[PDB]
Design a protein around this ligand. Structure first.
Ligand SMILES: O=C(NS(=O)(=O)c1ccc(NCC2CCOCC2)c([N+](=O)[O-])c1)c1ccc(-c2ccc(N3CCC[C@H]3c3ccccc3Cl)cc2)cc1Oc1cnc2[nH]ccc2c1
Length: 140
């Protein structure tokens, strides 16, 4: 169903983000999310450089960091751009975890991302046409 899609969408996104850094951890939705995320990460490159320096990820701090950042991200509601930002931020947390020899946290972050999508973003996504609408709007 939709939830099986979301977990797959998270796993394929993280897998690509980590592969970009040399770490080995329909498809139109995945391709669209990759391309939109790559655009987002270039546009907001400076923002992520600043935020990554403020995260201080450890196994003890990671869950709280994820929770507070994502709550700030969606403070004014949901739209597709913020959903892209959510994936990009999760990708950044995963890359930082690997950078810090904390690679097991990738699995935790993937689970947190999946549970946030299924519990908090699923209603908006379906209310706004599902992932198919995202592909229509921003796909190649
Ligand atoms: O309204 C917004 N966005 S939109 O819906 O109009 C729209 C616009 C364009 C696109 N697609 C562009 C295509 C794609 C195909 O290829 C060709 C171009 C899409 N999309 O694809 O969905 C949607 C909008 C809301 C929020 C923030 C935003 C959030 C968070 C942050 N920060 C930066 C640091 C981390 C994060 C953060 C900050 C505070 C708290 C937590 C966090 Cl994590 C910065 C900006 C930016 C927004 O603008 C953009 C601008 N360009 C973007 N490009 C891709 C996504 C996108 C979003």
């Amino acid at each position: 169903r939709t939830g099986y899609d979301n977990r797959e969408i998270v796993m394929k996104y993280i897998h690509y983000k980590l592969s970009q850094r040399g770490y080995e951890w329909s498809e139109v939705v995945h391709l669209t999310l990759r391309q939109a995320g790559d655009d987002f990460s270039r546009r907001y490159r400076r923002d992520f450089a600043e935020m990554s320096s403020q995260l201080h990820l450890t196994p003890f701090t990671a869950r709280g960091r994820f929770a507070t950042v994502v709550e700030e991200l969606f403070r004014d509601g949901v739209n597709w751009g913020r959903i892209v930002a959510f994936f990009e931020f999760g990708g950044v947390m995963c890359v930082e975890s690997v950078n810090r020899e904390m690679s097991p946290l990738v699995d935790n972050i993937a689970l947190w991302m999946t549970e946030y999508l299924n519990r908090h973003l699923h209603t908006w996504i379906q209310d706004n046409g599902g992932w198919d609408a995202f592909v229509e709007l921003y796909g190649p």
